[PDB]
Amino acid sequence: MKLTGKQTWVFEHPIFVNSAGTAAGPKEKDGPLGSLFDKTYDEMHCNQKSWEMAERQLMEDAVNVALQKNNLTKDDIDLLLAGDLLNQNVTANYVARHLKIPFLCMFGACSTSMETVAVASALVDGGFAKRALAATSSHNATAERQFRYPTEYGGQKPDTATSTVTGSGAVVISQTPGDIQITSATVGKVSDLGITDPFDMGSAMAPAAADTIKQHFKDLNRTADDYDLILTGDLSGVGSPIVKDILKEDGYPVGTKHDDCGLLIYTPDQQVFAGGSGCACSAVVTYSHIFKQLREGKLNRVFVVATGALLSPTMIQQKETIPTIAHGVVFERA
Amino acid sequence: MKLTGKQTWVFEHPIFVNSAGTAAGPKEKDGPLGSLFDKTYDEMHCNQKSWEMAERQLMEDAVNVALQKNNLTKDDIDLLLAGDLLNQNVTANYVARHLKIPFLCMFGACSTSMETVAVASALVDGGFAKRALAATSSHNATAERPDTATSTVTGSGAVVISQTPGDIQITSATVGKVSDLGITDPFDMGSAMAPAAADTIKQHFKDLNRTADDYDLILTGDLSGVGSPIVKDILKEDGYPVGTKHDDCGLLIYTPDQQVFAGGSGCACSAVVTYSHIFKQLREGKLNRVFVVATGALLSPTMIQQKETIPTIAHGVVFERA
Numbered sequence: 001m002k003l004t005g006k007q008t009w010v011f012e013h014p015i016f017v018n019s020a021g022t023a024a025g026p027k028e029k030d031g032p033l034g035s036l037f038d039k040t041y042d043e044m045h046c047n048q049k050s051w052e053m054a055e056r057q058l059m060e061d062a063v064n065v066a067l068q069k070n071n072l073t074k075d076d077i078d079l080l081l082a083g084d085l086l087n088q089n090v091t092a093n094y095v096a097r098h099l100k101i102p103f104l105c106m107f108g109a110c111s112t113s114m115e116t117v118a119v120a121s122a123l124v125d126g127g128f129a130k131r132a133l134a135a136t137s138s139h140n141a142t143a144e145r146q147f148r149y150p151t152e153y154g155g156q157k158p159d160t161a162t163s164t165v166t167g168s169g170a171v172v173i174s175q176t177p178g179d180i181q182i183t184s185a186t187v188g189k190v191s192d193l194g195i196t197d198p199f200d201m202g203s204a205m206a207p208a209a210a211d212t213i214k215q216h217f218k219d220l221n222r223t224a225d226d227y228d229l230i231l232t233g234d235l236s237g238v239g240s241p242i243v244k245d246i247l248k249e250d251g252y253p254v255g256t257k258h259d260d261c262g263l264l265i266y267t268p269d270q271q272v273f274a275g276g277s278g279c280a281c282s283a284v285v286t287y288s289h290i291f292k293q294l295r296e297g298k299l300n301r302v303f304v305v306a307t308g309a310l311l312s313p314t315m316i317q318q319k320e321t322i323p324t325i326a327h328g329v330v331f332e333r334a
Numbered sequence: 335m336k337l338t339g340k341q342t343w344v345f346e347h348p349i350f351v352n353s354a355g356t357a358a359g360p361k362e363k364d365g366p367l368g369s370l371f372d373k374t375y376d377e378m379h380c381n382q383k384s385w386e387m388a389e390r391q392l393m394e395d396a397v398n399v400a401l402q403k404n405n406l407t408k409d410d411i412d413l414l415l416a417g418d419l420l421n422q423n424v425t426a427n428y429v430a431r432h433l434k435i436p437f438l439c440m441f442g443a444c445s446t447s448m449e450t451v452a453v454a455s456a457l458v459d460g461g462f463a464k465r466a467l468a469a470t471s472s473h474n475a476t477a478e479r480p481d482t483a484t485s486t487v488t489g490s491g492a493v494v495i496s497q498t499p500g501d502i503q504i505t506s507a508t509v510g511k512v513s514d515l516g517i518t519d520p521f522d523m524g525s526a527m528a529p530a531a532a533d534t535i536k537q538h539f540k541d542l543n544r545t546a547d548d549y550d551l552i553l554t555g556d557l558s559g560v561g562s563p564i565v566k567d568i569l570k571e572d573g574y575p576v577g578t579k580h581d582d583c584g585l586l587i588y589t590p591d592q593q594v595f596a597g598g599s600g601c602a603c604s605a606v607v608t609y610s611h612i613f614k615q616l617r618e619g620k621l622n623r624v625f626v627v628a629t630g631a632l633l634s635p636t637m638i639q640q641k642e643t644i645p646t647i648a649h650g651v652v653f654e655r656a
Binding site for chain 1: 335336337340341343383384386387412413417421422423424427428430431433434435436437438439440441442443449453456457459460461462463464509510511512513514632633634636637640642645647
């Protein structure tokens with residue numbers, strides 16, 4: 001079987017990333033990775049009438065640029081796996097309306113990034129799709145109309161807070177040889193240690209990432225030594241240290257091989273509090289900077305773990321806790 | 335390859351439904367299928383403090399009853415594929431927190447029913463999971479937050495899928511694509527989803543070189559009173575008449591006396607009707623090959639506020655009396 005261990009998929013047929021596209025907003029463009037994005041904007045509106053339309057334009061760009069690079073058209077794709085953090089997945093659904101590609105709407109909060117890639121890889125390895133397209137997007141303002149710090153009460157947004165990344169990433173997956181190769185994926189399970197504070201996501205998601213990372217090592221009988229980098233989605237300032245401790249306390253120290261996209265996307269000068277977040281966070285950083293590091297040879301085997309928080313206002317209203325999840329995928333220099 | 339045609343998956347290894355569980359609310363319990371549900375309630379609250387907790391209890395029931403029937407425990411499951419129509423998928427996420435089974439949150443409006451089952455079948459056939467659990471739920475109250483309107487079904491259905499022999503067998507699935515003819519009226523879903531169902535049904539026939547004659551029944555999710563006639567016309571106008579082999583869950587779940595307008599709707603609509611009544615018909619032999627097509631409308635208030643249209647989609651799965 002392809003299922004190895006408890007939660008890990010090891011693909012039999014070689015699965016590769018044929019092309020990757022990324023688009024990002026102004027704050028991203030001016031960040032330390034801004035020059036690596038395929039498309040950028042100076043205005044959050046992205047030349048659109050509304051925030052929702054902006055996020056859509058971001059995904060449109062990532063998808064088209066990805067298809068363009070591999071000299072492909074929407075008709076060369078068999079499956080489309082996408083999802084966004086805004087309810088009903090408006091972004092993906094409307095973009096899918098345009099692509100007219102058999103659509104499988106995914107959603108795992110800010111872990112959608114790797115969810116879509118993991119299942120897409122499995123469907124291409126299982127022979128259900130010759131070519132698959134996995135995409136995700138996020139917009140600072142759209143996510144703000146859904147949830148925001150109630151300033152009207154005079155309090156101040158805590159340092160534990162984070163800032164949603166404005167951008168989108170898309171990737172093309174198939175059995176056709178490429179520079180980057182997807183070798184395994186670990187599907188995570190829901191974790192809930194009891195966190196209730198909706199403003200400290202880092203500490204809430206840390207356990208989920210550690211769980212998935214730990215189960216992944218055990219499933220493949222591997223350790224941190226088997227990777228050049230263990231990249232986490234958006235644990236940011238608060239969660240990064242916490243995940244490194246839990247891993248160490250579990251006998252699987254990640255040491256200095258760990259890093260987080262939310263810490264790489266921006267610079268501590270762009271007033272982004274703890275660090276970056278959002279579905280687009282892990283996606284834009286991986287599809288541009290970590291794919292590149294891998295192509296250039298600066299890296300060989302990386303483990304990307306997108307983390308997500310499944311918390312709604314109505315639930316926190318009923319004294320419920322904040323469940324979290326983490327999904328991981330292993331990328332390697334072909 | 336397993337991919338046949340444009341959008342259809344034909345599984346190589348035999349995939350079966352080992353067990354199915356369903357739970358429903360009062361209006362369902364008193365309907366013409368009420369006696370077939372595993373668990374029912376007389377109060378929409380389902381002995382819970384809030385509507386959200388009620389829906390959760392509904393999914394808990396369906397999952398446990400399904401696991402109970404096949405003498406299984408949450409630890410016997412490798413993958414959990416569920417989704418609900420309320421934003422952020424609160425129901426599935428919290429239920430998943432309890433099952434602690436590797437979770438893949440799905441969402442395709444009222445088509446989630448078949449989406450979860452189709453991808454679950456593919457992951458079990460591809461060898462990524464020995465046992466998969468697909469579930470969906472819907473609650474009339476959480477859903478709200480003329481003669482064209484519909485009424486959300488209160489209930490939940492769950493199924494267990496694996497390569498271990500069972501009474502019902504899943505032989506193929508057709509993944510649908512987004513359709514948008516231009517409907518903008520958020521109160522006539524039947525006419526908005528009809529095209530999506532017709533498209534998926536048509537592509538499915540062409541992919542497998544089949545016709546309506548190859549099925550004893552073509553079941554649609556919740557086209558209801560308005561969409562059912564429309565889908566039959568489009569199919570006829572396309573050279574693929576479904577004739578009298580068509581029926582809709584929203585027309586079977588309730589009786590035109592329970593004041594449910596056009597008919598039933600919601601993720602739970604197609605699920606509870608299929609996992610109880612149509613699985614049973616198949617076990618008893620009253621049916622042999624059925625094609626279930628769950629349809630969904632992807633419309634939000636904020637989008638309709640910007641003069642946008644209503645995109646829809648339909649996913650189908652072929653269940654066969656093994």
